[PDB]
Amino acid sequence: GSMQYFAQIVNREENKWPSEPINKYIHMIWIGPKNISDKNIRLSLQTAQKNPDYSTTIIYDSGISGYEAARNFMSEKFKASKITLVDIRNKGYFHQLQQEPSFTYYEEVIRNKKFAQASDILRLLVLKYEGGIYKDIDDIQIKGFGSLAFPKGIGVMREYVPEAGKSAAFPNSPIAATKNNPVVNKTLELAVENYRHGEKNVLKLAGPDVFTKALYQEIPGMCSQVLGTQLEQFELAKRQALKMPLEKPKSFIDEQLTLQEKAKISRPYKAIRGLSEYVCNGADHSWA
Ligand SMILES: [Cl-]
């Protein structure tokens, strides 16, 4: 045979990480005394309707003064649906959450009434113990999830580019993850280090930029430049096995790596971005 070893390397990269199933829980958070908007109520109902095999819950907090007025508003609006409000205090692992370093900052942030900044922390704690899919009340459910399985047990959206930043960022919503996922844990570790270091920058706390940085440490290929570098290395490796000029191709027609070979190498990192065909992101936090 010829090129059978090179074709074996390409096939190894396609299934290097087996896809792990995701628990069928849709976690959504709405904490504070502000009432949920009419749009977010309709999107939440649409979320539960499009996922009858998922149990959809909206997580509120009873440790915030004035929470009853907003919680009473949600129950009357969701009493005839599959949306079941669950208090984070009444969780079956709340005593373990109190022993988490991030929960002290969660308590410290809700006291300052920075509810959106606190939601970035709680969503990772819920995915740590229970797992499943976190989604925000503003995220639009395009189609139902069904049985989802992701390489490394982690599913995210396509990364966006901040209009002034220099690095892309994966949104921290929606996030699909297995129970006690390494990417979720590393995001919590970086979040604790940022809060320990008094990071006044809201981006360098528990938001998408921190979730992205933790995703790159566990799965370095998620960085577009890293995967692109890996494709250029296979291009040179194929030329060496072909006994062709060991050089980077000048034009596209001179590339030896076929499109099918590029797709095989990129298969794991495409699947991790699989949540983009199920959910459309909302911009409620943008207007805030
Ligand atoms: Cl060979």
Author numbering: 15 to 302
Task: Give the article text.
In order to characterize the mechanism of operation of these proteins and to shed light onto their architecture, we initiated crystallization trials with different constructs. sYeGT was crystallized in the absence of ligands and in the presence of UDP-GlcNAc and manganese chloride. Interestingly, in the absence of ligands, sYeGT crystals belonging to space group P43212 appeared rapidly and diffracted X-rays up to 2.3-Å resolution while in the presence of UDP-GlcNAc, P21 crystals were visible only after 8 weeks but diffracted better, with a resolution up to 1.12 Å. After accurate determination of twinning parameters, the phase problem of the ligand bound structure was solved by molecular replacement and refined to final R and Rfree values of 15.3 and 16.9, respectively. This structure was consequently used to support molecular replacement and model building of the ligand free structure, which was refined to final R and Rfree values of 20.4 and 24.5, respectively. The ligand-free structure features four molecules in the asymmetric unit. All protomers show clear features in the electron density map for residues 258 to 267, so that they could be included in the structure. Similar to the ligand-bound structure, the C-terminal residues were not resolved and not included in the final structure. Superimposition of the ligand-free and ligand bound sYeGT structures showed no major conformational change upon nucleotide binding. Residues 257 to 267, which are resolved in the ligand-free structure only, form a loop that connects two helices of the 3-helix bundle. At the C terminus, the last resolved residues (294–301) are covering the empty nucleotide-binding site in the ligand free structure, while they are pointing outward in the UDP-bound sYeGT structure. In the ligand free structure, Asp-298 stabilizes the covering position of the C terminus over the unoccupied nucleotide binding side, as it forms a salt bridge with Lys-53, a residue located close to the uridine base binding site.
